[PDB]
Amino acid sequence: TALKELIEELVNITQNQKAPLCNGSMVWSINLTAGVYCAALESLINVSGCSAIEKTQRMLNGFCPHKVSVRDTKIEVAQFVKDLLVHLKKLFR
Amino acid sequence: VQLLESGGGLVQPGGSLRLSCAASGFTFSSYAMSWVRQAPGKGLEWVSAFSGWDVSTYYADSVKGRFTISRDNSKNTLYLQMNSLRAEDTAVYYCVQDGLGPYFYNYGMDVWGQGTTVTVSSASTKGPSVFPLAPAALGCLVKDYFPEPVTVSWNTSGVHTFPAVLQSSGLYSLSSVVTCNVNHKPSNTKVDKKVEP
Amino acid sequence: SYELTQPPSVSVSPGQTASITCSGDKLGDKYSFWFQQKPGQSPVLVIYHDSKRPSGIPERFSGSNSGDTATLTISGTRAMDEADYYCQAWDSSTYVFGTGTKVTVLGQPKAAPSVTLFPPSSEELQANKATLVCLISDFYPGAVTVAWKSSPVKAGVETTTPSKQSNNKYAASSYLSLTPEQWKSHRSYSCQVTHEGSTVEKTVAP
C-alpha cells in the first residue's frame, strides 16, 4: 500500500530521457537484504544539490525506525535507485 | 490536497461528538492521519493518530479511553469519536495529513485542515444584561450571555466592540465604547438602551 | 524529549534575523519539525527533518537540530512572517509540541495604551453586582499585562487577549467582579496596564 507509493516515486525519477539522476554524484552500494531502507537512507544522506531525490529521501524516513544524519563499491545514484527499485518490487510479491 | 473537518458544535460535559474529515488530493490509504487540537488562546496539543501502514492507533494520555480515532479509506475520511467529554476538551480540532510508512512519525506531518470548533460547557443558554457606562467616551456593557456570539450596534464615528471575555461560570461579557443594539439570538433577545451621566 | 520548551516571545525589526529556540532532553537525536501559525489560520509546515524546507516555503526559513536545542532561523524577517511558531518531536508513542513562540515583526513605532476605566453602573449596583470595566486601546505591539488593585486583587479578574483594531493597533479589556459592599468600601480601585515595560494606570472612586 505505502510501499508502492515509494516504488512509483522511484519509477518516476527513473524515467527515460531525463538528465542522469543527481548529476554524477555517487554513493555507496548496499546489500539488498534486510535493513535496506535504513541503509539506502544513510547512503543517500550526503547527496548534495538534487531536488529529484527529496521526496524519495523523505519517504524512506518513514521506513526506518531511527533518525539518520559496508563500503565496497561506489555507484552512481541513478544506478543506486535502479537497484533498490528492483528489490522493492520483489518484496511486494 | 484538502482536509475538510465537520461535526463540531456545542455539547455538555459527559456528552458525545463524532468529528469527520473528508480528505482529497492524495492517496489517503497510504498516509497516517492525526487529530491535533488547540484550546482558545493556547498552544497545539496532539490528540491521536491512525497509522497508514498498520491498524495501530496512538493517543495522548489526556484522551485515552475516551477518544477513538477511525478511518475509512473507501470514502477517504477520518473520524474521531469523543465520549465522556470534559470542559478542558474545548478546542478547535484539526485533521492533519501525517506520515507515510510503518514509522510514520519519522516522516512527519504535512498539510492541516481548517478545523472545526468543539465547545464543552455545562451552562445553558441565556440572554445578556445591558448596563450603562457613564462619562468623550460613552460605553455599553453586555453581561452574562451564553453561548457565543453576540453583535452590538449603535445606529461608527470611532467605536470599538471589544472581544468578549469568558467568566468562571461559563458565561460571557463584553463592552463597546464610542468616542446600543444588542442581539443574542442563541437566546432570542434583542435589547437597546442609551446612556447619559 | 517529553517536554519541549520554547521562549514565549521573539521580537525583531524587519530585515533582521529572528532565531527561535526549542530545548528538549536529547532533542538532537530526534527529528525536529517546525510549524508556523499566522493569526486566524491553521498551522503550515515550514521545516521538516531538522533542516528541510517543504515545497513553496520561503527560502529565508532554515532549521538546525543539534545536541538538545532545535533552532528555526528567519533571515531578513519580513512583515508577513509574524506568526506563532511551534516546535515538535516524537517521543514515547506521542507527538510532543513545543510551548510556542510568538514572533512579532515590529512594523510600526511603539504606541502607548490609552485607558478608560468605567465605574459600576447604577442599575448593576441595584442588581447586587459590581463590575469595573477597564478598556485598553491603541497600543503596539499587541501584548499588555494588567494588574488590578491599593492592595493586589488576585480574584474576580478576567482579561481578554489583545486584538487588532481598525488602525492595526491593538486593544484589550479587563473586568474586576465586585459586590457593592467592596465598591464603596475601599477608597479607589486601580487598573494598571503594563505595556512595554512602562505602565499607565487609572483609578476610580464612588
Nearest chain A alpha carbon to B51: A2
> What is the CATH topology of the domain spanning B129-193?
Immunoglobulin-like (2.60.40)
> Which residues touch A22 (CB under 8 Å, ≥6 apart)?
A47, A49, A50, A52, A53, A77, A78
> Which residues touch A34 (CB under 8 Å, ≥6 apart)?
none
Q: Which of B29, B31, B107 sits opposite A61 (nearest CB)?
A: B107
Contacts B53 to A, Cβ<8 Å: 1-2
Q: Is the dihedral of CA A71, A76, A79, A81 positive or negative?
A: positive
CA B35 to CA B98: how far, in whole Å? 9
> Which residues touch C42 (CB under 8 Å, ≥6 apart)?
B94, B112, B113, B114, B115
Task: Please check whether residue B30 touches A, CB under 8 A.
Answer: yes
Q: CA torsion angle for B52, B54, B55, B59 (degrees, to 10)?
A: -80
Q: Which of B105, B129, B160 sits opposite C137 (nearest CB)?
A: B160
Residues C133 and C156 in one domain: yes
Residue boundaries of the structural domains of chain B: 2-120, 129-193
Q: What grid cell was written down for A9? A: 516515486
C52 and A54 within 8 Å at the Cβ level: the answer is yes
Contacts A59 to C, Cβ<8 Å: none
Q: What grid cell was written down for C139? A: 497600543
Residue boundaries of the structural domains of chain A: 1-93
The CATH number of the domain holding residue C153 is: 2.60.40.10
C119 and B134 within 8 Å at the Cβ level: the answer is yes
Give the chains touching A; criterion: ≥3 Cβ pairs < 8 Å.
B, C
Q: What is the DSSP code (8-state) at residue C106?
A: -
Beta bridge partners of B139: B133, B177
Task: Please check whether residue A65 touches B, CB under 8 A.
Answer: yes
Nearest chain A alpha carbon to B27: A5
Q: Which of B27, B29, B106 sits opposite A62 (nearest CB)?
A: B106
Q: Residue A77 burial (CB < 10 Å; 0-12/13-18/19+)?
A: buried
CB B144 within 8 A of CB B126: yes
CA B191 to CA C30: how far, in whole Å? 57
One-letter amino acid at C28 equals G
One-letter amino acid at B56 equals S
Residue C18 structural domain: 9-105
Resolution, given in Å to one decimal, reads: 2.1
Q: Which of B27, B103, B108 sits opposite A64 (nearest CB)?
A: B103
Residues C76 and C134 in one domain: no
One-letter amino acid at C8 equals P
Domain boundary among C83, C105, C127: C105
C97 and B46 within 8 Å at the Cβ level: the answer is yes
Residues C73 and C127 in one domain: no
Would residue C79 count as lying in a domain?
yes
Q: Which of C124, C173, C174, C202 to mutate to test the interface with B (most CBs of B within 10 A)?
A: C173
Task: Please check whether residue C90 touches A, CB under 8 A.
Answer: no
Q: Which of C32, C33, C47, C49 to mutate to test the interface with A (most CBs of A within 10 A)?
A: C49
Q: How far does CA B78 lie from the centroid of its chain?
A: 18
Residues C141 and C187 in one domain: yes
Pairing of strands B189-192, B181-184: antiparallel
CA B26 to CA B59: how far, in whole Å? 24
Instruction: Return contacts of A45-48, CB within 8 angstroms, 24+ apart.
Output: A45/A69, A47/A22, A47/A77
Query: What is chain B written as a DSSP string?
Result: -EEEEE--EEE-TT--EEEEEEEESS-GGGEEEEEEEE-TTS--EEEEEE-SSSS-EEE-TTTTTTEEEEEETTTTEEEEEE-S--GGG-EEEEEEEEEESTTHHHH----B---EEEEE--PPPBPPEEEEE----EEEEEEEEBSS--EEE----SEEEPPPEE-TTS-EEEEEEE--EEEETTTTEEEE-----
Task: Please check whether residue C52 touches A, CB under 8 A.
Answer: yes
CA C72 to CA C65: how far, in whole Å? 9
Q: How far does CA B86 lie from the centroid of its chain?
A: 14
Contacts B99 to A, Cβ<8 Å: 62
Residues C99 and C120 in one domain: no
Would residue C2 count as lying in a domain?
no
CA C144 to CA C87: how far, in whole Å? 25
Beta bridge partners of C157: C176
Residues C46 and C73 in one domain: yes
Query: What is C110-174 written as a DSSP string?
Result: -BPPEEEEEPPPHHHHHTT-EEEEEEEEEEBSS--EEEE------SSEEEPPPEE-TTS-EEEEE
A2 and B52 within 8 Å at the Cβ level: the answer is yes
B7 to chain A, minimum CA–CA distance in Å?
29
CB B120 within 8 A of CB B153: no
The number of residues making up chain C comes to 206
CA B7 to CA C205: how far, in whole Å? 49
Residues C118 and C70 in one domain: no
**Smallest Cα–Cα separation from B99: which of B58, B68, B154?**
B58
What's the total number of domains in chain C?
Answer: 2
The number of residues making up chain B comes to 197
Q: Which of C86, C158, C161 sits opposite B43 (nearest CB)?
A: C86
Residues C37-71 as b/e (b if ≥16 CB within 10 A, e otherwise) read beeeebbbbbbbbbebbbeebeeebebebeeebbb
CB B84 within 8 A of CB B22: no
Would residue C3 count as lying in a domain?
no
Three-state DSSP state, A37: helix
C-beta atoms surrounding C14 within 10 Å: 12
CA distances from A34 to A64, A88, C202 (A): 12, 11, 73
Contacts C2 to B, Cβ<8 Å: none
**Smallest Cα–Cα separation from B23: which of B73, B87, B92, B89?**
B73
Residues C101 and C120 in one domain: no
Out of 2.60.40.10, 3.30.300.30, 2.40.10.10, 2.40.160.20, which CATH number does the structure's domain B2-120 have?
2.60.40.10
3-state helix, strand, coil in chain A (%, to 5): 50, 5, 45
Residues C137-158 as b/e (b if ≥16 CB within 10 A, e otherwise) read bebbbbbbebbbeeeebeebbe
Residues C97 and C150 in one domain: no
Nearest chain B alpha carbon to C174: B165
One-letter amino acid at C180 equals P
B106 and A65 within 8 Å at the Cβ level: the answer is yes
Residues C16 and C47 in one domain: yes
**Smallest Cα–Cα separation from B125: which of B6, B12, B7, B19?**
B12
Contacts C164 to B, Cβ<8 Å: none
Residues C71 and C33 in one domain: yes
Three-state DSSP state, C22: strand
Would residue C138 count as lying in a domain?
yes
* Chain A residues within 8 angstroms (CB to CB) of chain C: 54, 58, 61, 67, 69
How big is the CA angle at B59 (ends B38 and B17), to the nearest 5 degrees?
Answer: 60
Contacts C175 to B, Cβ<8 Å: 165, 173
Q: List gaps in chain C by the residue before each (C–N > 2.5 Å).
A: 149
Terminal CA-CA length for chain B: 58
CB C183 within 8 A of CB C156: no
One-letter amino acid at C5 equals T
CA C22 to CA C6: how far, in whole Å? 5
Three-state DSSP state, A52: helix
Pairing of strands C83-91, B9-11: unpaired
Give the chains touching B; criterion: ≥3 Cβ pairs < 8 Å.
A, C
Q: CA torsion angle for A36, B58, B38, B61 (degrees, to 10)?
A: -130
CA B145 to CA B173: how far, in whole Å? 7
- Residue written as cell 445553558? B124
Cis peptide before C141 (omega within 30 of 0): yes
How big is the CA angle at A21 (ends A20 and A23), to the nearest 5 degrees?
Answer: 70
> Which residues touch A70 (CB under 8 Å, ≥6 apart)?
A28, A30, A31
